[PDB]
Design a protein around this ligand. Structure first.
Ligand SMILES: CNCc1ccc(Oc2cccnc2)o1
Length: 330
């Protein structure tokens, strides 16, 4: 089998991407944030504290003939941006782009933090990291991809995120019309539960490439590109007026600037992020200070190749017995 679904930016800045997901019988369609940095499939639901729901579409398990309470199971998760959610668990039928899994753990939110409530466009998350990170207790549950894998034509999924435009998540096949040149594959460590790999270096604009190992994660659920302070300082030094602002919480730059590109290495290959991808607009409405899309990972404890980086590529998440990642230009 295979699946193919369109993923759409939630706003004009590509702050996140949502993908429609069918849950239950008859289908309840919710728009979920596909997240290769976490491993829980959770949804706003009929169980979510009423004051914490504001415009989201909810899953109502009592209206699904295939829903079953997973007795005694609870979940609780925190994300790197300070947000969190928790609740109980059902199993139900889940389909993405024509690909169906029966008996998928669907984690129903009883509580969500303020930044979830405040984003009406995100109805929940669909985790695509390794199932070892799944938070369900006392019996850990499998991701949608792990449940689907045996049935897939090939044990892979691909992320093709758009810049200010829709893109695609495919399951079970590689669309050879969706990229240019060849796909360069690189080793993955699953020791931390992430799609963790090592970039071979970087360049800023038309500058010379610096060969240096940068260990990080391919994370569709993180908006920006978080890299070591040395690398980030080298980038923003090429933008007149750019500076790190403690009060804003990162590098900002004059909105009048034209930003240089940023290149990262994948083996001997190179992926170029155009300058415009790095502009996240005014820090507040009407400001002439703009927020940068490349930020320091110091304090996070890991480097993160988030959407800013991944949307410049066609990305293969290869879930064979020894997992690997593939990157192509597009
Ligand atoms: C804006 N905070 C709530 C929210 C929306 C989407 C996500 O999920 C995330 C956020 C950061 C990293 N990984 C996943 O959280």
């Amino acid at each position: 089998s295979t699946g193919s679904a369109t993923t759409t930016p939630i706003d004009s800045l590509d702050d996140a991407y949502i993908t429609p997901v069918q849950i239950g019988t008859p289908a309840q369609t919710l728009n979920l944030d596909f997240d290769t940095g976490s491993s829980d499939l959770w949804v706003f639901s009929s169980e979510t504290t009423a004051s914490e729901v504001d415009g989201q579409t909810i899953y109502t398990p009592s209206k699904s003939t295939t829903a079953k309470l997973l007795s005694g199971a609870t979940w609780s998760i925190s994300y790197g941006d300070g947000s969190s959610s928790s609740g109980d668990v059902y199993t139900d039928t889940v389909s993405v782009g024509g690909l169906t899994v029966t008996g998928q753990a669907v984690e129903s939110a009883k509580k969500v933090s303020s930044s979830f409530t405040e984003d009406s466009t995100i109805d929940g998350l669909l985790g695509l990291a390794f199932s070892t990170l799944n938070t369900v207790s006392p019996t850990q549950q499998k991701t949608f991809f792990d449940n689907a894998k045996a049935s897939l034509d090939s044990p892979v999924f691909t992320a093709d995120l758009g810049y200010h435009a829709p893109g695609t998540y495919n399951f079970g096949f590689i669309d050879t019309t969706a990229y240019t040149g060849s796909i360069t594959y690189t080793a993955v460590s699953t020791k931390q539960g992430f799609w963790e790999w090592t970039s071979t270096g970087y360049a800023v604009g038309s500058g010379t490439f610096k060969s240096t190992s940068i260990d990080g994660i391919a994370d569709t659920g993180t908006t920006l590109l978080y890299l070591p302070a040395t690398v980030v300082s080298a980038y923003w030094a090429q933008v007149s007026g750019a500076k790190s602002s403690s009060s804003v919480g990162g590098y900002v730059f004059p909105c009048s600037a034209t930003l240089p590109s940023f290149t990262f290495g994948v083996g001997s290959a190179r992926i170029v992020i155009p300058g415009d991808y790095i502009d996240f607009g005014p820090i507040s409405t009407g400001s002439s200070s703009c927020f940068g899309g490349i930020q320091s990972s110091a304090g996070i404890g890991i480097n993160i190749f988030g959407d800013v980086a991944l949307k410049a590529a066609f990305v293969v998440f290869n879930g064979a017995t020894t997992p690997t990642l593939g990157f192509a230009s597009k």
